[PDB]
Amino acid sequence: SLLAEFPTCPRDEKDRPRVFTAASGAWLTDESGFRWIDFDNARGSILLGHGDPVVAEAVARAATGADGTATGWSRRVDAVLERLHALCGGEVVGLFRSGTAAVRAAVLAVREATGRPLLLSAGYHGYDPMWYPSEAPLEPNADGVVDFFFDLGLLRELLRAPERVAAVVVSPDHMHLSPGWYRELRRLCSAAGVVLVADEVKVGLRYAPGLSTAELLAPDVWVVAKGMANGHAVSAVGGSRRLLKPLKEVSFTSFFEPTILAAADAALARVATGEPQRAVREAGDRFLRHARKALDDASLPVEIAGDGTFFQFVPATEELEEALYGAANAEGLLFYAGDNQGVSAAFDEAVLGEAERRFARVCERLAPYAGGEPVGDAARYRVAWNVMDGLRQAPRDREETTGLLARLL
Amino acid sequence: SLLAEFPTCPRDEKDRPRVFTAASGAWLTDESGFRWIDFDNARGSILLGHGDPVVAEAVARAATGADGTATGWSRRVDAVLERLHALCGGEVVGLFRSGTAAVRAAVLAVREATGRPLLLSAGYHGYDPMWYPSEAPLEPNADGVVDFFFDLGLLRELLRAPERVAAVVVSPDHMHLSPGWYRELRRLCSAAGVVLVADEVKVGLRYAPGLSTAELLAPDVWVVAKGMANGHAVSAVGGSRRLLKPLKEVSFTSFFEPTILAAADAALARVATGEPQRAVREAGDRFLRHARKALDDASLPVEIAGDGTFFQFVPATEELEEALYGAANAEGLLFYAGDNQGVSAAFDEAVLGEAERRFARVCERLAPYAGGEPVGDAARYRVAWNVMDGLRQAPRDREETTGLLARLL
Ligand SMILES: Cc1ncc(COP(=O)(O)O)c(CNC[C@H]2O[C@H](O[C@H]3[C@@H](O)[C@H](O[C@@H]4[C@@H](O)[C@H](N)C[C@H](N)[C@H]4O[C@H]4O[C@H](CN)[C@@H](O)[C@H](O)[C@H]4N)O[C@@H]3CO)[C@H](N)[C@@H](O)[C@@H]2O)c1O
Ligand SMILES: Cc1ncc(COP(=O)(O)O)c(CNC[C@H]2O[C@H](O[C@H]3[C@@H](O)[C@H](O[C@@H]4[C@@H](O)[C@H](N)C[C@H](N)[C@H]4O[C@H]4O[C@H](CN)[C@@H](O)[C@H](O)[C@H]4N)O[C@@H]3CO)[C@H](N)[C@@H](O)[C@@H]2O)c1O
Ligand SMILES: [Cl-]
Ligand SMILES: [Cl-]
């Protein structure tokens, strides 16, 4: 309890952080010697696998000073910038030290460039107080942000006075929003004359070499991070020269640190091939097939949203959800509790076989829950809110919307 | 110009970033093969030396998976937190990904905890737009910050309604402010009952194992960064549980990235001994003794402020300033232009001997400037503003103070 922060991490039944000593590909070792298969993967930022040898080699060599210095420019700066520009498009690119920092800088730049005060937001954008909730729904917070919770009806309401709106800023979820949802969001923004920022810190580079919403949203400004460096401390923003001109004022001391550049250059090279993304989808799909069959065979009322790139357990009750993760912990399957599971490209045959076996045992442990009432919508909404910080897409009217917000805020 | 940002770095006569392809110790190699002795050292964040072997081996181990995982807690988290707490004091500690992020989080936490609106600031606190200049000098900016430019007369007036003030936040400079100045700041903050935040991102851990202002200011909250990881992308905040309770809300995806943790634990272990800070002070003092003697023997009107830990050339004219850095550049002495020079612990007997030879040659190249009018106060004020973003300490009244603000802002 020296730590002033509350980091999101794997925690035990007493809410104490699990202490991990080492990791390799899909596997972790804890301080008790217990061995785990990782579906958390630093919240999906470990796309390639823990201790990736090719990234590791690049990082080790950069640490010796052999690839340039934190004092100033190296050609790896140009490499990283060019790689991102090719994958994501736009006219310019900037680099940052976290997803939180990049999305804040992006949106403040757009607010400066447009001269308009309000940001309309769906999803999570990082830890900064600028994103804290307002006094009431549909009211701006103290930093001019209004949350629309992915409800396009609420967005239309807010877009009635678009002259106030610097940008719509959206964190995609491809488990809970359809392609059609995105095209409608795009349409609404375009017709309102408002800038669209795609916060792809989580989903960027993971579904494909580039932005997951490149065509669906064709955002004016993008942000990525988790996909770009196999976990290392870098994020990126890009888009029009005009909207991002205010980023000229960004400078920070560690900008040229060569280990982070080494990791991003290495990881981005593999990302560009599309191979790790395919591997993840395929491995995760294989795991899902099996897990869905095990749950059904055991009469357990747990749906799975999403797909192999990112999936989420949707249990019929809170009690079962807790039991599910307790059983998974007991069997050494480390899931990101309540949230999305994101396998890495290190999920090979060997790993998948073991994970399949362990999950069968998870389902045995849950035998007491067999035959429970099937999953209903309240559960779907609750569980989706945990991953997206807003409302999954499904038919509603305004009164149902209000009630869901009143419940879930 | 893919890059949307304008990073601070060594730049050539066309303002293009210098490309450095390698580094070891005190030495850089540029793209053309030229070897430079580095006094910039990533703005003083390279306290140990480029490619420090022990840091680099630690980073190499951590890159392989064998020393923690990005998915969660590791023993290095504890080690880093404990070491910071021992060196800097306070009740709790938080980690962040840049000095910019750390200072913003710290001052926002105090504002939240105190419930008071205004932050009274002196010095640079990073790139975030919360520190942008107010439209009217000495009035609050859009984020509630009033810059007082290190003038304690102005601070007195701003403290006349202390109930409005969340914190005074100050970036120390030990070249341009005396101990007595710090003691007066502490006395003023204490009499107003206001919280004092020491932004030691640059100076922390570099003058001593701990805070440069530990006794002088006895700050309620501290921030450090440049001293803690030999360049790697981490910073820290610490202070009272109360004031920093709002940091519970901080979480970021790369928190457990093992290479940065291993670098911090290694660098901090060295810092705790006091040895690198002593080496730096002694090596720098030896270089200054020599440079001062060379400038004087050449009748060049250049003073040097500061000491071995951080020093700054103060030329009599802007023309001579530009010539001085042109000359240094030609001799492969890489100074942080206009700002403070911070040698590293890798400045050994051989480096120093070669630096002295090169600097003597610099003075030879500046021969046309011999006999020039000696440095005056307008030059001292202009040059100090470049390094501290406010006013060097000297006797003034309010006429002279406001005159200087109008000139230098
Ligand atoms: C699109 C996007 N944009 C920007 C960023 C920021 O990038 P970064 O700075 O590099 O981390 C991210 C970073 N992503 C990390 C995670 O962000 C969310 O997770 C958030 C949030 O959803 C989740 O919120 C929790 C909520 O799900 C639970 N129902 C209730 C819990 N109290 C609450 O916890 C969080 O909010 C509390 C507010 N009081 C706070 O006290 C908690 O400590 C805080 N963790 O906590 C996470 C932050 O730590 C996503 N669910 C996840 O898929 C994702 O992996 C991102 O996904
Ligand atoms: C106490 C403290 N607190 C927090 C931080 C932030 O930590 P970080 O996020 O890890 O970098 C730092 C980081 N420190 C970096 C530097 O901060 C200052 O440097 C600033 C500022 O003084 C300096 O300002 C320049 C000024 O000295 C020149 N006379 C004029 C020039 N236009 C101006 O340029 C900079 O600020 C402009 C202000 N709008 C901006 O437009 C320019 O693009 C920017 N380069 O630019 C630097 C930004 O990188 C100090 N002089 C230096 O000793 C120090 O190394 C810190 O020292
Ligand atoms: Cl003063
Ligand atoms: Cl001058």
Curated annotation (Swiss-Prot), chains A, B:
Provide this UniProt record's keywords sorted from A to Z: Aminotransferase, Antibiotic biosynthesis, Pyridoxal phosphate, Transferase
Q: Name one process (GO BP) from the record.
A: neomycin biosynthetic process
Q: What is its EC number?
A: 2.6.1.93, 2.6.1.95
Quick one: which pathway? Antibiotic biosynthesis; neomycin biosynthesis
A single GO molecular-function term is: transaminase activity
- A Pfam family (short name) is Aminotran_3
**Is-annotated flag, keyword Transferase?**
yes
According to its UniProt record, which cofactors does this protein need? pyridoxal 5'-phosphate
Q: Which residues cross the membrane?
A: none
Catalysed reactions, as listed in the record: neomycin C + 2-oxoglutarate = 6'''-deamino-6'''-oxoneomycin C + L-glutamate; neamine + 2-oxoglutarate = 6'-oxoparomamine + L-glutamate
Q: What does this protein do?
A: 6'-oxoglucosaminyl:L-glutamate aminotransferase that catalyzes pyridoxal-5'-phosphate-mediated transamination for the conversion of paromamine to neamine in the biosynthetic pathway of neomycin. Also able to catalyze deamination at C-6''' of neomycin.
Protein family according to the UniProt entry? Belongs to the class-III pyridoxal-phosphate-dependent aminotransferase family.
> What name appears for this protein in its UniProt entry?
Neamine transaminase NeoN
